[PDB]
Amino acid sequence: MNVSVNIKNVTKEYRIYRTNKERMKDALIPKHKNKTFFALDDISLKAYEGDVIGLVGINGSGKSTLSNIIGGSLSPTVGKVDRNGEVSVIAISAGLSGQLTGIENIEFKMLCMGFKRKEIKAMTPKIIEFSELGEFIYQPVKKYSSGMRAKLGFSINITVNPDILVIDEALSVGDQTFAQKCLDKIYEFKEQNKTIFFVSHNLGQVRQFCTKIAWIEGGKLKDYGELDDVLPKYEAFLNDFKKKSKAEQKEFRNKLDESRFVIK
Amino acid sequence: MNVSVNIKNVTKEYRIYRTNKERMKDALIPKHKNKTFFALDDISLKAYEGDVIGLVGINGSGKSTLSNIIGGSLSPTVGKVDRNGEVSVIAISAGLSGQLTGIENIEFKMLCMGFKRKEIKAMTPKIIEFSELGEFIYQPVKKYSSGMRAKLGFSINITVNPDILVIDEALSVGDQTFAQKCLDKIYEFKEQNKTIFFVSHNLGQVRQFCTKIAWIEGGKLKDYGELDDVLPKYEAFLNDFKKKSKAEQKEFRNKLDESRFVIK
Amino acid sequence: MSAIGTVFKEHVKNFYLIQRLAQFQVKIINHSNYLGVAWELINPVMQIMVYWMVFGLGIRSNAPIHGVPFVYWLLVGISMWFFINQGILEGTKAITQKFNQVSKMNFPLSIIPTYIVTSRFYGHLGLLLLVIIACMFTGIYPSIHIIQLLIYVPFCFFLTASVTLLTSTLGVLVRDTQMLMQAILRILFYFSPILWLPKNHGISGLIHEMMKYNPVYFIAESYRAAILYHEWYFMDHWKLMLYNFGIVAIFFAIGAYLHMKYRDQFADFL
Amino acid sequence: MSAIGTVFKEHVKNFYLIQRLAQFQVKIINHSNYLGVAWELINPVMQIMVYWMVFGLGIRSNAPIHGVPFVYWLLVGISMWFFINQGILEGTKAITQKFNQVSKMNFPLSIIPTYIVTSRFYGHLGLLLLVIIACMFTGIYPSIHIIQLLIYVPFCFFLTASVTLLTSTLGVLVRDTQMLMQAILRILFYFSPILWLPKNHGISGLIHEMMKYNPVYFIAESYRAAILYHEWYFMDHWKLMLYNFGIVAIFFAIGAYLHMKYRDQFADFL
Ligand SMILES: CCCCCCCCCCC(CCCCCCCCCC)(CO[C@@H]1O[C@H](CO)[C@@H](O[C@H]2O[C@H](CO)[C@@H](O)[C@H](O)[C@H]2O)[C@H](O)[C@H]1O)CO[C@@H]1O[C@H](CO)[C@@H](O[C@H]2O[C@H](CO)[C@@H](O)[C@H](O)[C@H]2O)[C@H](O)[C@H]1O
Ligand SMILES: CCCCCCCCCCC(CCCCCCCCCC)(CO[C@@H]1O[C@H](CO)[C@@H](O[C@H]2O[C@H](CO)[C@@H](O)[C@H](O)[C@H]2O)[C@H](O)[C@H]1O)CO[C@@H]1O[C@H](CO)[C@@H](O[C@H]2O[C@H](CO)[C@@H](O)[C@H](O)[C@H]2O)[C@H](O)[C@H]1O
Ligand SMILES: CCCCCCCCCCC(CCCCCCCCCC)(CO[C@@H]1O[C@H](CO)[C@@H](O[C@H]2O[C@H](CO)[C@@H](O)[C@H](O)[C@H]2O)[C@H](O)[C@H]1O)CO[C@@H]1O[C@H](CO)[C@@H](O[C@H]2O[C@H](CO)[C@@H](O)[C@H](O)[C@H]2O)[C@H](O)[C@H]1O
Ligand SMILES: Nc1ncnc2c1ncn2[C@@H]1O[C@H](COP(=O)(O)OP(=O)(O)OP(O)(O)=S)[C@@H](O)[C@H]1O
Ligand SMILES: Nc1ncnc2c1ncn2[C@@H]1O[C@H](COP(=O)(O)OP(=O)(O)OP(O)(O)=S)[C@@H](O)[C@H]1O
Ligand SMILES: [Mg+2]
Ligand SMILES: [Mg+2]
């Protein structure tokens, strides 16, 4: 009943250049007209506490732009985001250095997330136990496999305790023997009534995890509502798209991209 | 009936150090004894023409090491790989530069794969048409979304014509509307009777794509044979692993890692 | 005025964070070396040997300066240079290559060039300790005048940090700014008292008078007076110290305002 | 002997590939600049102004050398330096940051430091053209002696490429080697005829005689004789040219052997 995230009329615009001469004229002339791309265009949705919201849409729709705007990394060109509570983003690799050993990466990434010295010293061993790396935790991260690096990054990233959580493209990580622990940890995050924003193309995890769907189409919020109301319509759009010809799909893509570009 | 890839007794060993003092003693002393890790241990399998071989196993098994040894990037410590034919690896991002525009990346990546000037000028437009990037093909790659970068990298990477193909972790790329074209292109690669090595954890794509399974467990070839013979046993191992306790799983991991480490 | 208090408070509750991230950066840039983090000591010493072979033997034939042999005179003067040059060079681009790894975390963004500077300040402190120990081997022993280093070494750190705080924000807004620093640092190097004194060579009314506006002139002269000459440097050069403090305050003020104005938009310029 | 033929053949069937990858590298390192790829021209010119302010006005008060004013004398001498320094610095680490992007492709691995060197050779050619045009504005016009540049500029490119081919392989095997290059290049810079001539200043029997073993001395002197002095440089300095050709051949031979021995194992050292 209490609003945790309030997005009001958020627009993200990017100036589009082909040469350095165009970039320099836009910088130096106060009323220069240039091509502008709308990554987002007047997004208005409000999130309550305990809402698990899935961000669906085709490639280049603007869901990572909206997720970065919610997470605070990116500023809106226009509009405001009001967040009641702390925001954490689960991105496994942002603090991981190949040069540092796995034990060193846990402290460096944890320091960069804002944990204190006593907290890092307290919860390093269960991060080591969760990662299941064994003897390679004293080895440099550039010597890891991709699944080992993903497991270590997820084990560091899962220890946050925010009010608003943002997850991008991965509920789970690793092989089949490791994914269930990740699902249990994410479901434990869901169990303590936190606002979770999920950005993925895996519609099975979206259906089994989320409670609300925000459909983004061409920089705009196409639909927002309950999962059983909005997700069948996105699935119907997805099956309707494959039954068109190549000319019809190109016409749809061109009509989508026509409104997103403007000279101003 | 003709052997395309012949792997005979391939072993990959890595020296393991904790301090710089140990690394310096190993470098400077002719008979220094040190901890050695077996990434691979006496691998012997031979591939015929038209074989589609799936490399399965848990994280850190050594399947990327075997795939890089087959692809020529990594040298065996012991043993020999004999390849009849050219080898190409589908890794989408290896030549992609954020600073370069998508049109510039296609030429730079294609030059680095070894294509000639007339070939690059000939097949640039169908790469642009396959990528479906639209107006963003003249924009820098650092301004792309992750799906757009993946689509461009796949569109450049799919144009090779080898005798032996190595695919790592991705048959498809992009959203649901783009994955079917990737599946059609990979199946077209399968249709011209090429030896394909597939490394993935997605067992559905492995079952629907591969004809032979190479199971790697702890740096060793656990089983090699037909898909219907070997893949149910790997699936049985996978379901047997989740029904153990945490102590039993730790004991299995420790027993696996005990044989892989040796002082020599 | 709120920008000054904001940057100051983000620097004072994150002192341990700055030190630990600087130690991690030192370990990161020296990871594949066989000698490890000793190269932060070895490479300035080799450059010192090159500069003494050129500017000591080739120019003045290793003649003493002010009753001190030239090797120790140059050794005290060049000790802070490598830190200043490396900190200004690396921390101008610090937000350019370090913003994206801390963008999604709640991080104090103004301390990134400060820990990049502190990663070179560690090697500066080690080199200064070796320089004092090497000066002990001739007959120049630490007197009571060496406690001025407790003022002068933090001043060198704060000058480098303020210049770096301004130039990191300017580098994100205009990348061309990082290209300017190569010529700017050579201007700061050669127009200084570190390799020569233009009193026994040429014109003092123009070359030596304009060298006073360089902060490097004060830092090299102050270390030499603290370590070699055994004099209180602030009795005769208090106006120069006040000018240098004003330069540091102006750099900190302009850098703190620019960072607070563009910090939300950094993803846009990157 | 097979290593020489292998590296030579990989360089001669990939000439267009080297040129196009060098152009792409030039566009990559100058992408976020407002001025674009003009900084490869602008930054050496600013450094030239700094070096003329210091070593021309401060040292010799802009006195002419050999009937030529000092600005054009320094301008012809320092033209190849920035290319040599930048190519040796960047291409020592070229396989360290460029092997992984071409490891899974069938690529000629010996041309990676060569295109890294050629990316600086483009700016060297532009700077040399501007230097000749600037020398036209005084009264020094191109005579028949300027066709020696067709020998001397490729010699500078081949020296940089051979040294870079050796030092790139050594940098992958020992990372410490890249740390050595900072002192080595300052030795090559200051012990040369680019900023000064030790004939009217100090000792010629030791300083000037040992400067002949530097390849930089031949390259600066040869460009000056081709451009400024209007003389055939190989009539009086053929032994120095033979010594420099032997140095280039020795560097190419040792670099080509080491690269062929470790190229399969590069993933191990990286
Ligand atoms: C050798 C090379 C030579 C060429 C160099 C030319 C470069 C000049 C660049 C100018 C620059 C650098 C600061 C200058 C240096 C610091 C000065 C002190 C230095 C002393 C040592 C200053 O731009 C500043 O931008 C501020 C914006 O808040 C603005 O504030 C006030 O402005 C108005 C009232 O004037 C008032 O309306 C506003 O509300 C105020 O807030 C400042 O007045 C303005 O100076 C940055 O330009 C900025 O770039 C931004 C992102 O690309 C861009 O925003 C984006 O918006 C969309 C995305 O979100 C999207 O559409 C575009 O991506 C882009 O539009 C800004 O529009 C642009 O301006
Ligand atoms: C300031 C810092 C000071 C400290 C610096 C100390 C650094 C010294 C390092 C020594 C070094 C650099 C070359 C030296 C520079 C070039 C010289 C010329 C320079 C002139 C300008 C030369 O090592 C060379 O290795 C060759 C290996 O083929 C070897 O060849 C012959 O050797 C035998 C007959 O002698 C004969 O048995 C062999 O068959 C021959 O082929 C050469 O004789 C040997 O010199 C490299 O060390 C190598 O590193 C390799 C990968 O880490 C390592 O292989 C790995 O194998 C497994 C993985 O696959 C795994 O187990 C390990 O990962 C590692 O074991 C090698 O074992 C090691 O040796
Ligand atoms: C890779 C290493 C190689 C190095 C390359 C070689 C280059 C070296 C340059 C040398 C230099 C640079 C000064 C440094 C400036 C620093 C500030 C710059 C700052 C700008 C940011 C140092 O020369 C110095 O300057 C004075 C010049 O003599 C001299 O001063 C004295 O003057 C008082 C009388 O006037 C005297 O009574 C008193 O004792 C001092 O006060 C100093 O003692 C002398 O050391 C310039 O001096 C040049 O060199 C010679 C010096 O001898 C000189 O030649 C000749 O001099 C005598 C006939 O005239 C003859 O007897 C010499 O035999 C012969 O040599 C040149 O004509 C001169 O132009
Ligand atoms: N800095 C930028 N400048 C210009 N366009 C940008 C920039 N960053 C992103 N875009 C464009 O913004 C659009 C949407 O961005 P994203 O949010 O990353 O896409 P997306 O909806 O997440 O789609 P995905 O990641 O492939 S599922 C795309 O067309 C991008 O090319
Ligand atoms: N340079 C290296 N030095 C030491 N160990 C290494 C090195 N490269 C890889 N390894 C180890 O070799 C083992 C197997 O490597 P990989 O082939 O990448 O693993 P993997 O079988 O592909 O498992 P994945 O990628 O998580 S499904 C792992 O334990 C790695 O840590
Ligand atoms: Mg892998
Ligand atoms: Mg995305």
Numbering used by the authors:
A (entry chain D), B (entry chain B): 1 to 264
C (entry chain C), D (entry chain A): 1 to 270
The authors write:
Wall teichoic acid (WTA) is a polyol phosphate polymer that covalently decorates peptidoglycan of gram-positive bacteria, including Staphylococcus aureus. Central to WTA biosynthesis is flipping of lipid-linked precursors across the cell membrane by TarGH, a type V ABC transporter. TarGH is a heterotetramer composed of two TarG polytopic transmembrane domains (TMD) and two TarH nucleotide binding domains (NBD). Like other ABC transporters, TarGH uses the energy derived from the ATP hydrolysis cycle in the NBDs to drive substrate transport across the membrane via the TMDs.
The cryo-EM structure of S. aureus TarGH in complex with ATPγS was determined to 2.3 Å resolution. One of the highest resolution ABC transporters yet determined by cryo-EM, the quality of the reconstruction permitted confident modelling of the complete sequences of TarG and TarH. In this ATPγS-bound state, three well-ordered LMNG molecules are observed. Two are bound in symmetrically disposed wedge-shaped clefts formed at the inner leaflet/cytosol interface between the TarH GH, TarG IFc and the LG-loop on the opposing TarG protomer (denoted LMNGC). The third ordered LMNG is observed on the extracellular face of TarG, on the dimer rotation axis (LMNGE). The level of detail at 2.3 Å resolution allowed unambiguous modelling of key active site features that show it to be in a non-optimal configuration for ATP hydrolysis. The aliphatic side chain of Val173 is inserted into a hydrophobic pocket, which includes invariant aromatics Phe154 and Phe178, with its backbone carbonyl flipped away from the active site and no longer in position to coordinate the catalytic water during ATP hydrolysis (we designate this D-loopOFF). An additional consequence of this rearranged D-loopOFF is the creation of a solvent exposed cytoplasmic channel of ~10 Å across at its narrowest that runs through the NBD dimer, continuous with the electropositive intramembrane cavity between the two TarG protomers. We speculate therefore that the LMNGC-bound (D-loopOFF) structure represents a substrate loaded state with the cytoplasmically oriented lipid-linked polymer captured at the inner leaflet of the membrane but prior to polymer insertion and translocation.
